[PDB]
Enzyme design. Structure first.
Site, PDB file in Angstrom:
ATOM      1  N   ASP A  15      52.447  40.645  39.513  1.00 12.69           N
ATOM      2  CA  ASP A  15      50.861  40.663  38.386  1.00 12.69           C
ATOM      3  C   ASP A  15      49.924  41.011  39.471  1.00 12.69           C
ATOM      4  O   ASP A  15      48.364  41.877  38.082  1.00 12.69           O
ATOM      5  CB  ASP A  15      50.967  39.414  37.859  1.00 12.69           C
ATOM      6  CG  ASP A  15      50.340  38.303  38.716  1.00 12.69           C
ATOM      7  OD1 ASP A  15      50.349  37.408  37.716  1.00 12.69           O
ATOM      8  OD2 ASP A  15      50.264  38.179  40.157  1.00 12.69           O
ATOM      9  N   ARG A  29      44.560  43.018  38.308  1.00 17.10           N
ATOM     10  CA  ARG A  29      45.748  42.129  37.519  1.00 17.10           C
ATOM     11  C   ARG A  29      46.037  43.049  36.877  1.00 17.10           C
ATOM     12  O   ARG A  29      45.520  44.033  35.882  1.00 17.10           O
ATOM     13  CB  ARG A  29      44.225  40.783  37.129  1.00 17.10           C
ATOM     14  CG  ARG A  29      45.458  40.305  36.146  1.00 17.10           C
ATOM     15  CD  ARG A  29      46.456  39.357  36.821  1.00 17.10           C
ATOM     16  NE  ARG A  29      47.077  38.607  35.565  1.00 17.10           N
ATOM     17  CZ  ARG A  29      47.780  38.190  34.731  1.00 17.10           C
ATOM     18  NH1 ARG A  29      48.747  39.431  34.380  1.00 17.10           N
ATOM     19  NH2 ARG A  29      48.821  37.251  34.496  1.00 17.10           N
ATOM     20  N   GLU A  37      55.872  34.128  39.834  1.00 19.48           N
ATOM     21  CA  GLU A  37      54.938  34.579  41.014  1.00 19.48           C
ATOM     22  C   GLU A  37      55.421  34.354  41.947  1.00 19.48           C
ATOM     23  O   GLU A  37      56.463  33.332  41.866  1.00 19.48           O
ATOM     24  CB  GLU A  37      53.304  34.004  40.238  1.00 19.48           C
ATOM     25  CG  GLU A  37      52.626  34.558  39.017  1.00 19.48           C
ATOM     26  CD  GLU A  37      51.412  33.426  39.225  1.00 19.48           C
ATOM     27  OE1 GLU A  37      50.575  33.302  38.420  1.00 19.48           O
ATOM     28  OE2 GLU A  37      49.831  33.257  40.550  1.00 19.48           O
ATOM     29  N   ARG A  81      38.795  40.613  39.598  1.00 21.83           N
ATOM     30  CA  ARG A  81      39.547  41.731  39.741  1.00 21.83           C
ATOM     31  C   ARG A  81      39.926  42.538  38.360  1.00 21.83           C
ATOM     32  O   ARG A  81      39.292  41.584  37.207  1.00 21.83           O
ATOM     33  CB  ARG A  81      41.131  40.453  39.586  1.00 21.83           C
ATOM     34  CG  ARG A  81      41.468  39.901  40.659  1.00 21.83           C
ATOM     35  CD  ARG A  81      43.095  38.897  40.594  1.00 21.83           C
ATOM     36  NE  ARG A  81      43.193  38.686  39.675  1.00 21.83           N
ATOM     37  CZ  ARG A  81      43.929  37.526  38.494  1.00 21.83           C
ATOM     38  NH1 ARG A  81      45.685  37.415  39.474  1.00 21.83           N
ATOM     39  NH2 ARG A  81      44.121  36.853  37.902  1.00 21.83           N
TER      40      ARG A  81
END
Length: 135
Positions: A15, A29, A37, A81
């Site tokens: 991701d 992101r 993950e 991010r």
């Protein structure tokens, strides 16, 4: 919404990817998707994590052109991010993960929800096809 060019620096997880954007390294992101993950603490490596991570990595490493597309709302999250839709040769990485059963549509926060129906449409098909997460 506008697409802007970027250059791959490193794939980090299913991701998250690091890109050179407007001459600055930035971590991005992927918007609107929850991807199993290989990082994360409440599990560390999750099931289908290595598979989602390899999918993203292959898709961006092998592209001729990477583009980022921000949505209408906040453009960065609380970890700094970028929040964006990422395209590899015209193909949206976020949608490709969902279509393959390697990500679910996440909890959505307006107004960062421009492609929400489009992804949910792909997610319904992946569950109908019983792919990966859905098998």
């Amino acid at each position: 919404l506008h697409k802007e060019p970027a250059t791959l620096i490193k794939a980090i997880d299913g991701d998250t990817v690091k890109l050179m954007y407007k001459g600055q390294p930035m971590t991005f992101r992927l918007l609107l998707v929850d991807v199993p993950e290989t990082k994360h603490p409440k599990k560390g490596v999750e099931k289908y994590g290595p598979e989602a991570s390899a999918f993203t990595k292959k898709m961006v490493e092998n592209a001729k052109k990477i583009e980022v597309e921000f949505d209408k709302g906040q453009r960065t999250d609380k970890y700094g991010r970028g929040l964006a839709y990422i395209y590899a040769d015209g193909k949206m990485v976020n949608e490709a993960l969902v279509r393959q059963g390697l990500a679910k549509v996440a909890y959505v926060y307006k107004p960062n929800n421009t492609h929400e129906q489009h992804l949910r449409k792909s997610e319904a098909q992946a569950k109908k096809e019983k792919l990966n997460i859905w098998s």
